[PDB]
Amino acid sequence: STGSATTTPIDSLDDAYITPVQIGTPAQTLNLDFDTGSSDLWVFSSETTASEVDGQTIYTPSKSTTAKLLSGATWSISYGDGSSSSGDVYTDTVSVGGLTVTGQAVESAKKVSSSFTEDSTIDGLLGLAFSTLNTVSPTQQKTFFDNAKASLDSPVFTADLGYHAPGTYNFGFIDTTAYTGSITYTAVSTKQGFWEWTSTGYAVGSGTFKSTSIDGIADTGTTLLYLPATVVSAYWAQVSGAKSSSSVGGYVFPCSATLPSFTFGVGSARIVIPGDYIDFGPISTGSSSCFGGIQSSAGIGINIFGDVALKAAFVVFNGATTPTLGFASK
């Protein structure tokens, strides 16, 4: 089997991407944030504290003939950005782009943090990291991909995120028309439960490539590119007037600037992030200070190849017995 679904930016900045997901019988379609940095499929639901729902579409398990309470199971998750959610668990039929999993754990939120409430466009998350990170207790549950894997034509999914435009998540096949040149594959460590890999270096604009190992995670659920302070300083030093602002929470730059590109290495291959991808616009409405899309990972504890990086590539998440990651230009 295979599946193919379009993923759409939630706003004009590509702050996140939503993908429609069918849950239950008859189908209830919710728009979920596909997150290769976590491993819970959770949704706003009829059980979510009413004051914490503000415009989201909810899953109502009582209206699904295939929903079953997973007795005794609870979940609770905290994300890198400080947001969180928790609740209980149902199993139900879940379909993405024509690919169907029966008995998928659907984690129903009883509580969500303010960031989730305030984002009316995201109805929940669909985790695509390794199932070892799943938070369901006392019986850990599998991700949608893990459940689908044996049925897929090939045990892979691909992320093809757009810049200010829709893109695609495919399951079970590699669309050879969706990228240019060849796909370069690179080793993955699953030791921390993430799609963790090592970039071979970077360049800023038309500058020389610096060969240096940068361990980080491929994370579709993180907006920006978070890299070591040395790398980030070298980038922003090429932008007149750019500075790190503790008050704003990172590097800012004059909105009048033309940003240089940023290249990262995948083995001997190179992925070029155009400068425009690094512009996250005014820090507040009407400001002439703009927020940078490349930020320091210092104090995160891990480097994160988030959407800024991933949307410059066609990315293969290869879930073979020994997982690997593939990157192609597009």
Swiss-Prot record:
Taken from the UniProt record, the cysteine pairs bridged by disulfide bonds within this chain are: 255-290
Which EC number applies?
Answer: 3.4.23.22
User: What does the UniProt keyword field contain?
Assistant: Aspartyl protease, Disulfide bond, Hydrolase, Protease, Signal, Zymogen
Q: Which GO terms describe its molecular function?
A: aspartic-type endopeptidase activity
- Active site, renumbered: 35, 199
> What reactions does this protein catalyze?
Hydrolysis of proteins with specificity similar to that of pepsin A, prefers hydrophobic residues at P1 and P1', but does not cleave 14-Ala-|-Leu-15 in the B chain of insulin or Z-Glu-Tyr. Clots milk
Any one GO BP annotation for this protein: proteolysis
- Per the database record, which ranges form the Peptidase A1 domain? 17-328
UniProt record similarity statement? Belongs to the peptidase A1 family.
Q: What is this protein called?
A: Endothiapepsin
Q: Which gene encodes it?
A: EAPA
Q: Which stretch of the full sequence is covered here?
A: 90 to 419 of 419
